[PDB]
Amino acid sequence: MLWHKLPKSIYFRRGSLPIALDEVITDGHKRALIVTDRFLFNNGYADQITSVLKAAGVETEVFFEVEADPTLSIVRKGAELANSFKPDVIIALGGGSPMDAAKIMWVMYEHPETHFEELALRFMDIRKRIYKFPKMGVKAKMIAVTTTSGTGSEVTPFAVVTDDATGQKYPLADYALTPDMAIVDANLVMDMPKSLCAFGGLDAVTHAMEAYVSVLASEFSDGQALQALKLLKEYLPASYHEGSKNPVARERVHSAATIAGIAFANAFLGVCHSMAHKLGSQFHIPHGLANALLICNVIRYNANDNPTKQTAFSQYDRPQARRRYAEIADHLGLSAPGDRTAAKIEKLLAWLETLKAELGIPKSIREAGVQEADFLANVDKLSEDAFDDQCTGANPRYPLISELKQILLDTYYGRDYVE
Amino acid sequence: MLWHKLPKSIYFRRGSLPIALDEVITDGHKRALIVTDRFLFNNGYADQITSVLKAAGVETEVFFEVEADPTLSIVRKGAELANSFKPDVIIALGGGSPMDAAKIMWVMYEHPETHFEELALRFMDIRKRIYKFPKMGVKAKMIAVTTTSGTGSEVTPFAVVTDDATGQKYPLADYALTPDMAIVDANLVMDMPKSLCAFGGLDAVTHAMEAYVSVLASEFSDGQALQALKLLKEYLPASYHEGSKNPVARERVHSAATIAGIAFANAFLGVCHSMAHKLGSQFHIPHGLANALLICNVIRYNANDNPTKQTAFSQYDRPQARRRYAEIADHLGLSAPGDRTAAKIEKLLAWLETLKAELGIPKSIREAGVQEADFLANVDKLSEDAFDDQCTGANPRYPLISELKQILLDTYYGRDYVE
């Protein structure tokens, strides 16, 4: 059985933010907290929402102390603040690291009794979950603005954090901590650098490419994934080169990244986000860049009509991955009439290299600043710990630790994944 | 040698606060921090200054986490914040606990190298000080609003804090941490409770009664002390009973409390503030209430023309304390023509009881919630540790530990201090 659940509000157009607070926050709340990173407190992005609340009978407080790949130390810090200001609403902002950290502070504020380890517990299903998350709408709601175009955390329950002790990103998940509102306005990403419009807008390509093929994939989460893929193909290159000079593309890509969140929130990720999380917390590689190096092989991995194993899901009778990856190309135009289902993937992978070459993305991990000695020494660790991530419990061929490492290395040496 | 140094600005009238920020802060600064207590963050007293700054090109941050009798834990907490927001100006508010804590955060922000123990070091003189405080006007200025009428911390270098480990208030002092501006508007004390208008407006009676008699007393700091005493006599009772119904008195008293700060900042306190600090940190008695129980005896102590010792100050040739306490009464009207310098003190002490009875002040410490067993057991401690306070190095008869305890006890049993 399946579902398609999101916030009961997703406002999205250039100029939507005040028209998403002049509307709902002030009509129901008078004590707000804001979560973001310093670059946005400094550059005047959080005073774009405190301007409109303080003008109303609302009292704001900003937790600008967040860092990339957030830790559990910060989260506990914002709760202390949240436990002191007693907010009626939380307004995450900045994209990813803040959003992934505010919806968990939302927890430690509603229920400070919680223990993070009981949240990072992998599971076989989301309903048959041992640590049923508590109900969180009673103390304060949770709003989610975003300033990047690669995460989808505005919609999805995923909340990636780090222990600060082991150094293991725990992509915990539960729909009980979806935002009540998601605001995705391109006013905030028009001036975003290229190092981000690439990594971000290129994870989104995975958010949707290992969601249209996942086993939990459904008709609900297949047209959105695609529409997140026909826009990242016609507007992502332009948003990189032209930047703010083509705000429509820098806008459409911002919506796509979110639409892919409308997909992978319902149809969880595959395996690229498992190896990515572990490969980007060890070597401190960003999210999107770990996903762009692997995706072009994971496909070569999941696209084997006769794998070693399937993921054992009723709705998934026969392995269809080699097929789905073709409907993708068939939808994007990469496919020519009279193909054979084996080139449509080549024509697809060819579109990525062509797309990774024109965004500043390297051809391997070695080129990405990781020493062969620091990799091979700890590869078996992140290859056993990827298997133990919750994201991999949805990809269509239940990878073997024998088979993950092989694609870690073939992405280090820029090789393929023949079998 | 002596001095009379204060901020280069003391604005004071009902409605002065915006006219003290619309004037100077915004003309020179664009990044401000505010320090206060929760009662004022909650009750809308800090958004009376953030309203006017944010309306300008200024970014504010409020450290509302302060508690009565502040600790060194909070102070180090606000520095972390101050080290993160990087303010151009600090705006203390609330009176006492915040003000005494912000001008020391000002230190840990300018010079985080400092070590509190090297600040709480008693000394024989302020110039001949071992730990010459550093220069602090370079990172951020320091403003000082006040919302109570008993402290004078707006003007004075005194910054009373607590280790949080030993529990010993260290009334450190240095003019290098005087505020650059002091704002004393009665708009903020009109709605102050009676438990505070009494304790506060009754310490001020000591701020000035052991400053007109101190050895460092000078013509500069004698008319102010008195004017702080002719106003606390004609307007303090009315500000207690009538409260906000006589805002002129609730205003004049607010200025007096500050004028006494113009005195005891230059002519340090005597001994009542030494025993008070130690007697109010052990039994958690408030400041003003520890000073109102003792003052009516310390006078009987300092008013002995033949004491055991003087304070050894050149300007202080013969003990004049028994005389000064008469010019006080002679100025307030308590004195009738044809007295003998021995009744003018009785007529003075009589004015206090008469004044302590009509403010809700008890007649002893026992009545103030302190058990005879918890007092006599630790009296010799706060009697040896009062002698070691910096305030007592200015009172005119260099008390003996033999003689302090005797007045601690006579204030417990409500007795006098015959000798």
DSSP state letters, A37-96 = -HHHHHTTSGGGTHHHHHTTT-EEEEE----SS-BHHHHHHHHHHHHHH--SEEEE-SSS
Q: Which of B104, B210, B123, B208 is nearest to B161 (CA)?
A: B104
Question: Distance from CA of residue A363 to its chain's centroid?
Answer: 22
Question: Distance from CA of residue B76 to its chain's centroid?
Answer: 22
Q: Helices (H) and strands (E) in chain B — how many of each?
A: 16, 6
> What is the C-alpha radius of gyration for chain A, rounded to an integer number of angstroms?
21
Question: Distance from CA of residue B373 to its chain's centroid?
Answer: 29
3-class DSSP string for A152-214:
CCCCCCCECCECCCCCCECCECCHHHCCCEEECCHHHCCCCCHHHHHHHHHHHHHHHHCCCCC
CB–CB contacts below 8 A, A to B: 12
Please answer whether residues B83 and B112 qualify as being in contact, where contact means their C-beta atoms are separated by less than 8 angstroms: yes
DSSP state letters, A317-334 = -S--HHHHHHHHHHHHT-
Closest partner residue to B65 (CB to CB) among A54, A62, A84 is: A84
Q: Which helix (H) or strand (E) holds A295?
A: helix A287-302
Q: Which residues pair with A142 in a beta bridge?
A: A90
B59: which chain A residues are within 8 Å (Cβ-Cβ)?
47
Closest-CA distance of chain A to residue B44, Å: 9
- The reply to whether A54 touches chain B by the CB within 8 Å rule is yes
DSSP B69: S
Residue A115 and residue A117: Cα distance in Å, rounded?
A: 6
Indicate whether B269 and B397 sit together in one domain.
yes
Indicate whether B11 and B113 sit together in one domain.
yes
> B59–A65: do the CB atoms touch at under 8 Å?
no
Which is it for the CA torsion B254, B259, B262, B263, positive or negative? negative
CB count in 10 Å sphere of residue B73: 13
- The reply to whether A56 touches chain B by the CB within 8 Å rule is no
Length of chain A as a residue count = 419
- The reply to whether B47 touches chain A by the CB within 8 Å rule is yes
Q: Which of A377, A3, A395 is nearest to A210 (CA)?
A: A395
Amino acid identity at B214: S
Residue B175 and residue B129: Cα distance in Å, rounded?
A: 12
> A64–B54: do the CB atoms touch at under 8 Å?
no
Select the residue from A30, A49, A54, A60 to test the B interface by mutation, using most B Cβ atoms within 10 A: A54
Residues 225-284 of B with CB under 8 A from A: none
DSSP B133: P
DSSP state letters, B28-65 = T-SEEEEE--HHHHHTTSGGGTHHHHHTTT-EEEEE--
Q: Which residue matches tokens 């290129």? A: A202
Six token digits for residue A115: 């223990």
Residue B190 and residue B243: Cα distance in Å, rounded?
A: 7
DSSP state letters, A237-259 = HHHHHTGGGSHHHHHHHHHHHHH
Indicate whether B131 and B217 sit together in one domain.
no
> B47–A59: do the CB atoms touch at under 8 Å?
yes
What are φ and ψ of residue B34, in 5° steps?
-130, 140
DSSP A35: E
Which is it for the CA torsion B338, B341, B346, B350, positive or negative? positive
A47: which chain B residues are within 8 Å (Cβ-Cβ)?
54, 59
- The reply to whether A67 touches chain B by the CB within 8 Å rule is no
Residue B306 and residue B295: Cα distance in Å, rounded?
A: 20
Q: Which residues pair with B90 in a beta bridge?
A: B33, B142
What are φ and ψ of residue A405, in 5° steps?
-50, -45
Indicate whether A384 and A411 sit together in one domain.
yes
Judged by DSSP in three states, A105 sits in: helix
Closest-CA distance of chain B to residue A83, Å: 12
Residue A45 and residue A33: Cα distance in Å, rounded?
A: 15
Residue A276 and residue A286: Cα distance in Å, rounded?
A: 9
The domain that holds B260 is classified in CATH as 1.20.1090.10
A65: which chain B residues are within 8 Å (Cβ-Cβ)?
84
A248 is in an annotated binding site: no
Indicate whether B198 and B186 sit together in one domain.
no
The domain that holds A151 is classified in CATH as 3.40.50.1970
DSSP B127: S
Strand ranges across the sheet with B31-35: B10-11, B181-183, B141-145, B89-92, B31-35, B59-63
Six token digits for residue B139: 């990172």
Indicate whether A181 and A229 sit together in one domain.
no
B273 is in an annotated binding site: yes
- The reply to whether A59 touches chain B by the CB within 8 Å rule is yes
Helix, strand, coil percentages (3-state) for chain B, rounded to 5, are 45, 5, 45
Closest-CA distance of chain A to residue B94, Å: 18
Residue B146 and residue B153: Cα distance in Å, rounded?
A: 8
Q: Cα(first)–Cα(last) distance of chain B, in Å?
A: 34
B22 is in an annotated binding site: no
Indicate whether B260 and B365 sit together in one domain.
yes
A160 is in an annotated binding site: yes
> B65–A47: do the CB atoms touch at under 8 Å?
no
> A64–B47: do the CB atoms touch at under 8 Å?
no
Q: Helices (H) and strands (E) in chain A — how many of each?
A: 16, 6
Q: Pick the residue from chain B with its C-alpha nearest to A50.
A: B54
Residue A85 and residue A107: Cα distance in Å, rounded?
A: 15
- A170, A193, A216 - which closes a domain: A193
B97 is in an annotated binding site: yes
Indicate whether A182 and A221 sit together in one domain.
no
Residue B117 and residue B132: Cα distance in Å, rounded?
A: 13
Which is it for the CA torsion B335, B341, B344, B346, positive or negative? negative
B60: which chain A residues are within 8 Å (Cβ-Cβ)?
none
Name the experimental technique: cryo-EM
What are φ and ψ of residue A159, in 5° steps?
-140, 90
A62: which chain B residues are within 8 Å (Cβ-Cβ)?
61
Q: Which residue matches tokens 């001008």? A: B103
Q: Which of A362, A377, A359, A341 is nearest to A413 (CA)?
A: A362
A284 is in an annotated binding site: no
CB count in 10 Å sphere of residue A245: 11
Select the residue from B40, B84, B86 to test the A interface by mutation, using most A Cβ atoms within 10 A: B84
> What is the C-alpha radius of gyration for chain B, rounded to an integer number of angstroms?
21
Q: Which residue matches tokens 């009662």? A: B39
Six token digits for residue A218: 């459904």
Closest-CA distance of chain B to residue A42, Å: 9
Q: Which of B3, B165, B8, B183 is nearest to B72 (CA)?
A: B165
CB-neighbour burial class of residue B330 (10 A; exposed 0-12, middle 13-18, buried 19+): middle
- The reply to whether B86 touches chain A by the CB within 8 Å rule is no
Select the residue from A34, A51, A84, A86 to test the B interface by mutation, using most B Cβ atoms within 10 A: A84
Q: From residue B142, give the alpha-carbon distance in Å to each of B32, B176, B319.
A: 10, 11, 39
A54: which chain B residues are within 8 Å (Cβ-Cβ)?
47, 54
Judged by DSSP in three states, A313 sits in: strand
- A152, A174, A193 - which closes a domain: A193
Resolution (A): 3.4
Indicate whether A47 and A85 sit together in one domain.
yes
Residue A384 and residue A388: Cα distance in Å, rounded?
A: 7
Which is it for the CA torsion A349, A354, A356, A361, positive or negative? positive
Q: Pick the residue from chain B with its C-alpha nearest to A55.
A: B51
- The residues near A396 (Cβ < 8 Å, ≥ 6 apart) are A213, A214, A215, A270, A302, A310, A311, A316, A319, A320, A321
B254 is in an annotated binding site: no
- A193, A220, A238 - which closes a domain: A193
Q: Which of B289, B265, B268, B267 is nearest to B277 (CA)?
A: B289
Domain count, chain A: 2
Closest-CA distance of chain A to residue B189, Å: 23
A61: which chain B residues are within 8 Å (Cβ-Cβ)?
62
- The reply to whether B64 touches chain A by the CB within 8 Å rule is yes
| Backbone gaps in chain B, preceding residues (C–N over 2.5 A) | none
Indicate whether A182 and A199 sit together in one domain.
no
DSSP state letters, B302-368 = H--SS-S----BTTB-S--HHHHHHHHHHHHT-PPTT--SSHHHHHHHHHHHHHHHTTT--SSSGGG
Residue B114 and residue A400: Cα distance in Å, rounded?
A: 57
Which is it for the CA torsion B98, B104, B107, B112, positive or negative? negative
Select the residue from A36, A59, A66 to test the B interface by mutation, using most B Cβ atoms within 10 A: A59
Q: Which residue matches tokens 């969601």? A: A211
A64: which chain B residues are within 8 Å (Cβ-Cβ)?
84
Range of the domain at B179: 1-193
DSSP state letters, B158-175 = -B--B-SSS--B--B--G
Q: Sort residue B36 into left (φ over 0), alpha (ψ -120 to 50) or beta.
A: beta
Q: Give the Cα-Cα-Cα angle A126, A129, A130 (nearest 5 degrees).
A: 165
Q: Give the Cα-Cα-Cα angle B101, B5, B156 (nearest 5 degrees).
A: 25
Closest partner residue to A65 (CB to CB) among B38, B65, B84 is: B84
Indicate whether A261 and A143 sit together in one domain.
no
Indicate whether B239 and B183 sit together in one domain.
no
